[PDB]
Design a protein around this ligand. Structure first.
Ligand SMILES: *C(=O)C1=CN[C@@H](C(=O)O)C(C)(C)S1
Ligand SMILES: [Cl-]
Length: 255
């Protein structure tokens, strides 16, 4: 088995769920195994934001201080004095994985508990958000806090991006931001053939957790929804992006 060999090569545990929405063909490997979701939660968080906010609501300017800044603020740290609109925060969260942006958006939808309730409402009984960034990235073996599964993350991404959980213009917004992600060049994007379009959100967490969730479009026909999650034995383990790229190639061959 190709996934098993990847786990051996990269000394990592893999979680895979892929669905061809045109055929209902799937590729799965430990699809119900829990992993820390890390920054991938940012995608579902914008999903819920878009359920609740009108387009003009996204123009609201959010003021914050140097004190609101956490550990990874590539865009937010450059706009303390002027603030950022919710739309700009969504852009920074999704495309740069800006942690302060995620936190500010989280507050707008009522925090982790509210995020969890809204995910439960769309049929996600698995994803378990409890914390803000960056604390959420740190999950110990056996814990379910701030974890989900490949199946549940893929299904929730599918719900917001492809299904009627959002109206078409809002689905388009989410997809456009994700298509233009800056952080995923070495992951799912690196494992698809030429001509395939990718809308992804990455994550990295403790125990060398390295994730990417995506909608991918072949040149012709219906989109594929894919979650590729991974973790390792040691708390301070480094990850290798190639694991995700190679796992994606396996999924592409199998479909
Ligand atoms: C999301 O998974 C992450 C976000 N921001 C950074 C952080 O330090 O928290 C990353 C290392 C990219 S992980
Ligand atoms: Cl990330």
């Amino acid at each position: 088995d190709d996934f098993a060999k990847l786990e051996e090569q990269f000394d990592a545990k893999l979680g895979i769920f892929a669905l061809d929405t045109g055929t209902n063909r799937t590729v799965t490997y430990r699809p119900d195994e829990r992993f820390a979701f890390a920054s991938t939660i940012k995608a579902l968080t914008v999903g819920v934001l878009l359920q609740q906010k009108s387009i003009e609501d996204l123009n609201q300017r959010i003021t914050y201080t140097r004190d609101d800044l956490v550990n990874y603020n590539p865009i937010t740290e450059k706009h303390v004095d002027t603030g950022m609109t919710l739309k700009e925060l969504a852009d920074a969260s999704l495309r740069y994985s800006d942690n302060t942006a995620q936190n500010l958006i989280l507050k707008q939808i009522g925090g982790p508990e509210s995020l969890k309730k809204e995910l439960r409402k769309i049929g996600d009984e698995v994803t378990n958000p409890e914390r803000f960034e960056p604390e959420l990235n740190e999950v110990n073996p056996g814990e379910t806090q701030d974890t989900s599964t490949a199946r549940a993350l893929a299904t929730s991404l599918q719900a917001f991006a492809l299904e009627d959980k959002l109206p078409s213009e809002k689905r388009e917004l989410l997809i456009d931001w994700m298509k233009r992600n800056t952080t995923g060049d070495a992951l799912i994007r690196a494992g698809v053939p030429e001509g395939w379009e990718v809308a992804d959100k990455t994550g990295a967490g403790s125990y060398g957790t390295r994730n990417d969730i995506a909608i991918i479009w072949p040149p012709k026909g219906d989109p594929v929804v894919l979650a590729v999650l991974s973790s390792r034995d040691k708390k301070d383990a480094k990850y290798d992006d190639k694991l995700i790229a190679e796992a994606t190639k396996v999924v592409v061959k199998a479909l």
